[PDB]
Amino acid sequence: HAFRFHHIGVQTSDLENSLGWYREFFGCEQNWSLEKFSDLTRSRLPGITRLVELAAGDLRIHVFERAADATPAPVAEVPQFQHLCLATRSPEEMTEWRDRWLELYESGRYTFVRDEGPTDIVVDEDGVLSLYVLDVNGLEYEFTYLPE
C-alpha cells in the first residue's frame, strides 16, 4: 500500500461531552492530549484550545475544540466528509450497536446536538446490514456487516 489511513479529525463544541461519549460508545482510550499549537495549526483552526487523540482498535480519532461560543449544528447541503463507516463482525453486533446507542442516549449522561435516534437495521439484496447513528455533535456514523 502506498499510504495507510492514520486518523480522522473531529471538531466539536464541547470537548468534555465528546470525550465521554466516544470513550463510552466506541470503547476508546486516550493516548495523549495537546494544548500547545504551532503557527500553522492556529492558522488552520483559529481558536483551537485542546486536541485529544482517541484510539478504538485500528481507528484513531483526533477530537478538538475551537470556539464554543455558540453550539451550531452540522450542515447537510454542503460538501463534507458526510459520515464514517465501521464494519462489524457478526449480524448480532449490529443489534448490539443500536441498543448501546439508545442506552447511552436516554441515560442522560450526554448532550446531543440532534435528537434523531438510530435508524433501523436494513438489509440490501446481497445480505449487507446497514445501521446509522449520530454522535453527540450530530455527525453520522455507519455500522455495517458485509458478508465478505
Next chain:
Amino acid sequence: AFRFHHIGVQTSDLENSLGWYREFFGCEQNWSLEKFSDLTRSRLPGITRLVELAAGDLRIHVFERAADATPAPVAEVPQFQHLCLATRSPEEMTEWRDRWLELYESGRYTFVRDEGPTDIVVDEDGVLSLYVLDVNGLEYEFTYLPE
C-alpha cells in the same frame, strides 16, 4: 472491536471528484450504484450516484446529491474536519505536495478553494505534516512518523 471500512465524501460534481481522486491518490473504482433504498434516500435526499473508490487500505464512497449550485465547506460547524494518511518515507511528503501542485496547475479539475498546500512542518518528535485540499475544499493531511 471494529474495523474502519470507508469514509463518505459528499460532492456537487461527482465526475470532477472522481477524476481528481483517481489521479491524486491512485484510486481505482470498485463499484457504483444509482438505485437506492428508502433509508439511503432519507439520509441523503436527492442522491443520484454513489461510487466506492479504493486506494491503499482506505475506501472512499464519493456520492453526488442534487447538484444545483456548487456550495463550499463550512468551517465553524461540527464536522469530520480532515482525513490523515501516513506515508512510508520522508521524501514521499514532498512527492505528495508536488503531485497536488501539478494536478492543480494542469487546469483539468475544478476546485472549490484556491488555497494551495501548506509547507511540510516538523513537530517535537520529528513527525512531518502536510495539509492539502481536495476538489471539494475538504482537508487531507499527509503524515510521516519516524517511530
